Amino acid sequence: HMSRVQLALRVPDLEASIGFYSKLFGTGPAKVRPGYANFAIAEPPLKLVLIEGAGEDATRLDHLGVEVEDSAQVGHAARRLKESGLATVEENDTHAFQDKVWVTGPGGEPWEVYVV
Structure with a gap:
């Protein structure tokens, strides 16, 4: 009966963003592939997905989710x-x-x- 939000961001620079979010949440990504990385954060409960955009100048929301x-x-x-x-x-x-x-x-x- 428990769940957690998923926040998928489209970022202009995947490498920069991986570094930022590792520091922000104090933990490294769970999965890294070219063009994307995933973080499974315990507190606050969150699945954070980073998607390389590159064809845009600023970070934007890609999609939102509930992981059950x-x-x-x-x-x-x-x-x-x-x-x-x-x-x-x-x-x-x-x-x-x-x-x-x-x-x-x-x-x-x-x-x-x-x-x-």
Whole structure:
């Protein structure tokens, strides 16, 4: 029943940003690949994703998310959101590539509820 927010930022300089966030949260990234890095932060509970943008001058929000523990949680979330009247798109186990629900806010900000 626990979850944590996911904050995905599109950054102009991945290397600079990896350094900054390591110092900010006091821990190194969990995964680094060309073009992206992930941090799993304990306090505050957070999944931080850094995506190389390079074709822009300043950091911008890429997407937002809620990372849940299992497939059953994604299902419950999907049903609750749909019941609430939100327009949702869902991909889930009945084995899925990824168990996930997508919704978008009125200002265009995209949200995803998912399992790692």
